[PDB]
Amino acid sequence: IRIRVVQMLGSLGGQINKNLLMMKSYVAWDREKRLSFAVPFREMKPVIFLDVFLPRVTELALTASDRQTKVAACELLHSMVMFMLGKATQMPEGGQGAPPMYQLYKRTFPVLLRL
Amino acid sequence: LQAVAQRDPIIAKQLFSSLFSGILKEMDKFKTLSEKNNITQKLLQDFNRFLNTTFSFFPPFVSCIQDISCQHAALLSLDPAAVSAGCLASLQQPVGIRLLEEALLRLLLPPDVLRWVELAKLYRSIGEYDVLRGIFTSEIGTKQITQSALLAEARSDYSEAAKQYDEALNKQDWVDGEPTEAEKDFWELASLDCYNHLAEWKSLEYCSTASIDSEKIWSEPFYQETYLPYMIRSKLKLLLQGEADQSLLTFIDKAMHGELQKAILELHYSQELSLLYLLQDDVDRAKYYIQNGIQSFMQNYSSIDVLLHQSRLTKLQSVQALTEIQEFISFISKQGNLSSQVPLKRLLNTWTNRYPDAKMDPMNIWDDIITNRCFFLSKIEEKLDISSLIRSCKFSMKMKMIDSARKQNNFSLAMKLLKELHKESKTRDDWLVSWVQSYCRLSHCRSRSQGCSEQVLTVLKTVSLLDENNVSSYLSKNILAFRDQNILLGTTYRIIANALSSEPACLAEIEEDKARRILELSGEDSEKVIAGLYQRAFQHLSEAVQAAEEEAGVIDAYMTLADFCDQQLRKEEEAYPALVVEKMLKALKLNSNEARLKFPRLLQIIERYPEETLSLMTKEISSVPCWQFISWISHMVALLDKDQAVAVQHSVEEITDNYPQAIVYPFIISSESTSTGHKNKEFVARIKSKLDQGGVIQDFINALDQLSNPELLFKDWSNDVRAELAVNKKNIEKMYERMYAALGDPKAPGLGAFRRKFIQTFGKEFDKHFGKGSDFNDITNMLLLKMNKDSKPPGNLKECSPWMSDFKVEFLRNELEIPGQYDGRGKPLPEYHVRIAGFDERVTVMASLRRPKRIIIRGHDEREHPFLVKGGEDLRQDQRVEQLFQVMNGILAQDSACSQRALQLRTYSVVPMTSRLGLIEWLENTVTLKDLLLNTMSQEEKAAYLSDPRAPPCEYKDWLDVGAYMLMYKGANRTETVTSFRKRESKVPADLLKRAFVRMSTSPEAFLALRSHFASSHALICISHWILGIGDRHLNNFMVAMETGGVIGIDFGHAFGSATQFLPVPELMPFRLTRQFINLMLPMKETGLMYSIMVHALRAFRSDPGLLTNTMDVFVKEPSFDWKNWYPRQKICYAKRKLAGANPAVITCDELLLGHEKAPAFRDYVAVARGSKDHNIRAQEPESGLSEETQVKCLMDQATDPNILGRTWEGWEPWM
Amino acid sequence: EVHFLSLATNFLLEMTSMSPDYPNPMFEHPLSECEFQEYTIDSDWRFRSTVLT
C-alpha cells in the first residue's frame, strides 16, 4: 500500500503534493503543567508532567497501523485520562467555575468519544 | 508506558527527556554543587562521544539529545560542530538553532563567532538570509566580503557570490588578514551551494573543487565528508550527461569495502546509486536500491514532525526523486520497447511530465527532475516521428526549466544553454518563436532596478530576436501568439520611454550605438522620440487587448493597457482616457480583485474628466460582473446626495435593493447629507423608501444611546453650542431642539436606569437655564457633571430596546445580520449566513474617556457576537482604515515576494451608526500585553515594583510634574537624554516576552515559529500604521491573540500623520517600540527579518500612489476632523511624498510645522526630530527618493531612538 | 541508535518494582461510592466487514 502511495505521490508532481500541508494549527494546549506524576522509586520521587504526551498519544490512539500498537496507545490514553480525572478531585483547581483541565477536557473528550 | 515507548520513538523521546529533567531537578536536593558539576562534565563528554561517534542520524534520537541539552544551561556547553552536523544530517535544524542561540545567550571578543557561523549554516539550510546579514552587520562578521556575497545572493546571484567567496578564500591578506577557519569553510560551502545553483557541468566540476589542498579514499576528511554530497552530485550529473570517467565508480567500489561507508551510502544516496546502475544498465541493483530508498525516506518522513513544514517539503522532494526513477524502471522491459511504439511513453511524459514542481521545490529539484526525464527518454530511445515527439518532450522540460527560473526571478541562468535551445529551436518556426518569448521574458525579468540603463544598453537583446519577419509564424499561430508579441513590444516600448523620461541623462542614452538610432526611429529631439515610443506602445497594447478580446488573459491585457494609460495621465497631470477607462470597465465586467482595486481610480477619472465619462457611462448602468463594489459603497452612499453621475446611483440602488442589509448603516451615516440636486433628492427618497422596517433598527439605536451616558452627551452638546455660538440661533436652535429631545423631554424611547432618571431630573433644569436658541454654559456643565456619574442599565437585560428585552426574531420583522461580514467580490452572498437572533445579553462596561460598552449578542446559528460600543466620533474614517487594510492585504497577495513570505494582516470591522454613536466588533481571543507580561513576571513584583518605582523614579523628578514636562522639553539635552533613558531600562527587567512566548511553547521549534509569526505581524502593523501616520499612545493599544500569536493594532484614533500635529503632548514616535520588542530574540539586532519585511513592503508600495490617493480621500476625507482637536490636499501630498521615498525626519519636521510651529521649543523639537545623536542627524545624506533599505533603516535609527531616549510622556510609558 | 532511547526508558521503567507505592494506587479515595466488578476484554481476527445475521 505505501509502495503504491509513494508511487502515486511521485507520479502526481509537486503542484498537487504541496497541498498535503493558516493559523498554523498549533496552540500548545495548556499554559500550565497542572497534570503531574511523581514516579515511585526507592530513593527519590521526581515529578513528571504528563501534559506534553496528551496530544501525541491522541493521534497515536486515533491513526496508527499495527493494531497491537493502536490498542496499546488507547490503553495508555485510558490510563492517563483515568488518573488525571482523579487528580482534580484531590485539590479543587480554581477558576470561574471548576475548570481544572478545561482546555484539556475540550481537547480530549470529543476525540475520546470519536474513538 | 513501557509497552508503548518502544513502539513510537517520539513518545520515547518525550518520556526520556521528561524523566531526565525530573531526576535532575530531584537529585540536587541532596547533592552538592561539586558532584553536580562533575556529573555535568561526564555527561557533556558522553554527548560529545554520542554525536561524534554516530553514523546514522535518527531524528527522534538526536532531537531528544538536543532537548536534553536545551533543558539545562550547564548542559548547554556541548560541541557546536557535532550538534550542527547532526541536526543538518538529521533535518533537526530548528532545535539546533534554539539550543545554539540560548547557549550563546547564557555564555554572554569571546570566540562565540564559532557557534555563530555554524548557526548561520542551518539558516541557509532553511533558506533564511536576513539573519545572516544581521550576523555579519556586527563585529561577528570578520570579513565583510562574506557580507557582500550575502547581499549578492540575496538577489539570487551565484556567479558574483562565487567570485566573492573565491576571492575571500584565495586571498589571506586583509586589513586584519587571516580569517578564521570557520569563515573560510562557510565561504567554500556557499561556493558549493551556488555551484549547485549554477548546475552547469563545468560549474559542477568546480563543485568538485578538485579536492583542494590535495585532500573511501577521500571520504576520510570531515570537510570532505561535508563535500561528499556535492562531489557525488557533480560526478553523477557529468556521467549521466555522457562522461565515462568511472573514477566515481571506482570510489564507490572502494566504499563498498567497509560496511559503514556503503551503509551510509544507501542511508542517504540510494536513488543516485540506482541512477548510476541504470547508466550501468544494472536494473536489478537499481531497483533494489531505489526501493530501499523508498523505505528509508518513508521512515524518515514518519519520523519528522508535521509542523516542520519545510522539512516535509524536502522529504517530498526526496520521495518524488525516488519515484521518477522507480516509475521509469517500472516499464523498461514490460511491454516491448525495441520497435513497439506504444503511445504510453508519448502519454506518460505529458503535462510537462505531470507537474514538474512549478514555482516551488527550488532549482535543485527542478534540474534533478529534468535530468532524470531526459536520461529516461534517451535510454528509451536507445533500447528502441517518435524522435520528434521525444525532442518536443525535452523542449517542454527545458521550457519549464526556463519559465520556472524566471518565476523565481532567477538571474544566474544558463543563457548560453538558452542560446543552444534557440539553435535547436530554429528547426521549426513554432518551437523557435516559443524559445523567443522565453528569452524575451527572461530579459524582462532581468530589468529589476537598473532596468532603465540595462534596457537602453540592450533592448531585450534586439527585442523579440528581431523576429518581425515571421510574426506569430507569419500569423499562422493563434491570435494569442500575436497578442503576446504585441504585449512584449508594447512592454519594451514603455520600458524604454519611461527609462528615458526618468533618466534623460542615461549612461547608455549618451552612448552612441545602433540601439539609440533604432530608438529614435521608433520614436533627433528627445521629446519626439519619447512621444513616438509611447504612441507605438499604446498602439501595440491596443492590438494585444483586441486580440485578447477575440477568442482571464483579456483581463490581463486590459490591466496592462489601463495601467499604461493611467501612467500617461499621471505624467500628463501635475477624450484620450475615454476608451482606456472603457477597457478597464470591460475588465471589471469579469470578477477579478486586481480590476476591483482600481475602482477608486475609476471614480477619480470619472470626476476629473466628466466631459467624456458622462457620455461613456450610458452603458454603465449595471456593469457589475456578479456582485461587488461593496467595500466602497460608503464612498458612493454619501456621494449620492452630491450631484453625481446617474449610472452609479442605478448600480447602487440595484445593490441595496437586492441587498437591503449591509448598506443600512452606511445609508444611515450618509442620510445626514435644485436644478440638478433635486435628482439626488428624489434618488435618496427612493432609496429610503426602499429601506425595510427601519423602525426596529431605530429602536435598537435608541437603546444603544440609552446605554450611553447622558452626561457625556450633554458635555458634547455644550462643546458644540460653544463652538457654534462663537449661524447662531438657527444651528443653536436646531441643536437646542436636539438637546431638548435628549434630556429636556421627561421620556425616552426605551427605558434605562441612569439616563432614564437623568432626563426627568435634569432636562427641565437645562431648558430653564437656556431659553436661548458661554460662561453660563460652563457653569451648567460643571453643575451637571458633579451629579451622579454611575451609569446603570436596566439590569444586564436591555429594557432600552423591546427587541433585546423580549420579542424574539420573527419572520414578520426583517432580521438584522452581523455587521461587516456581508462582502461580495462578484459573488452571490449566502443567506444561510449567521444573522442577529437570540439573546446572549450581558452589559459589559469598561472605564475610559468614552467608557466603551462591550455588548454580548447571540447569533442566528447560535454564535456569540462580541461588539464594542463607542460614543461621539465619526468612525467612517476607521471604515476607510479597514478598507485600506483590505487593500494593502490584497497588495501583499499580488506581490510575489510577500505571498512567498506569506504576509497578511489581521483586521477588525467598525460600524459607526452615527458620529455621536458607533459600534466596533470585539474579538475575545486577543489580549493586551500588559497583563500577558504581568502574570508571567512574579505578581508580588508585578504589584510592588510597578506601583512605587515604575512611573515616579524615571519620568516625574527628571521632568520636574505636569507642565514641567514642557520646560524640560525646552531643557532637554543629549546627556540627560541618555542618562534618563538608561535609568529607564535599568528601572525595568526584560525578557517578559520570552517568558510569555515559552509559556505557550511546547517544543522549541514551535516557539521559533511563534516568534517568527509574531515578529512578522508586528513589523507589518508598524509599517502599516506609520504609513497611515497613526500612532498608538501606549502598550495597551495593541491586542494579541494566543491562538496563533497574532498581534493586532488597536486604538487607531489619531488622524493621518497627526500625533503631535494637533496634540500638545508630543507623540513624535514612528511606531510603538520598546526594549522587549528588542528582547523578542536577543542575539539578533533588529536588522534581519523585520528589515527584510520592511524592504519587501516598501518595494510593493512603490506602485500604490496611483491607487491610495484615489481611495484615502474621495469626498472631503472626513471634514472637520483636522480642526476639531487644514486641508486634505496637504495630507495627500505628504502621503505621496512618503510613498515616493522620503526622509522620515523631514516628515516629522513637516508635521511639527503644521499645527505645532507656534509651540515653544518648536525648533528644539524639529532638531531632536532629526535625532539627538550625530549617528541620528546624519540622515540628511539620504533624502526623498532614497532606496527602500536606506529609508527603513534611517526610520528605525534616527526617528525611533533619540526621542524615546530623551523626550516622552509617562502615558506613553517610555520604559515600555 | 534507533532503539537506544526506547531500551533505556524500558530499563529505567521495569526496574521500578521494589517501590512500596509502586503497586499501591494513586488515590485510595474512590471517585464516589460505586460498585466495581471485574471486566474482561476479548479480541479475535474478526473485524467489521460484510456482516449479516
Side-chain angles (χ1 to χ4, degrees), chain B residues 815-818 822 830-837 859-860 865:
Chain B
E815 178 179 353
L816 320 180
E817 202 183 33
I818 321 301
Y822 201 70
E831 282 74 15
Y832 64 100
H833 179 254
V834 57
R835 273 71 190 256
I836 302 186
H860 182 74
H865 296 280

Side-chain angles (χ1 to χ4, degrees), chain A residues 2-3 6-18 20-23 27-32 41 43-50 52-53 57 60 66 68-69 72-73 76, chain B residues 1 3-4 7-8 11 15 18-19 22-23 26 30 294 298 301 306-307 309 312-313 316 319-320 323 326-327 330 354-361 932 936 996 999-1000 1002 1042-1044:
Chain A
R2 50 180 70 257
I3 285 166
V6 305
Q7 177 99 35
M8 61 79 71
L9 284 170
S11 78
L12 284 175
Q15 296 317 101
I16 173 166
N17 306 332
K18 49 177 47 60
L20 200 71
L21 308 190
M22 65 184 73
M23 183 278 288
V27 298
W29 282 9
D30 191 15
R31 307 297 300 284
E32 321 306 316
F41 271 126
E43 314 85 3
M44 73 291 291
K45 313 295 181 287
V47 180
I48 300 311
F49 315 130
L50 303 176
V52 295
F53 310 93
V57 58
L60 299 178
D66 192 82
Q68 173 55 83
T69 48
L76 188 67
Chain B
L1 278 172
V4 304
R7 303 302 182 92
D8 167 71
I11 59 174
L15 286 166
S18 56
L19 69 91
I23 195 49
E26 179 77 27
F30 37 80
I294 288 295
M298 183 278 288
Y301 181 78
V306 59
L307 73 165
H309 310 284
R312 306 317 203 76
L313 309 178
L316 292 178
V319 300
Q320 66 187 123
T323 315
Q326 73 86 0
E327 75 186 3
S330 63
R354 287 86 174 82
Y355 289 167
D357 317 324
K359 191 65 177 177
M360 173 46 237
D361 307 330
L932 192 61
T936 60
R999 194 164 177 271
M1000 72 304 297
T1002 47
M1042 73 291 291
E1043 57 173 1
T1044 190

Side-chain angles (χ1 to χ4, degrees), chain B residues 968-983 985-986:
Chain B
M968 295 296 172
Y969 301 157
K970 270 76 72 176
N973 61 74
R974 184 179 181 161
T975 79
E976 67 87 20
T977 296
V978 184
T979 300
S980 59
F981 167 69
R982 193 262 309 154
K983 163 203 54 172
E985 70 272 14
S986 63

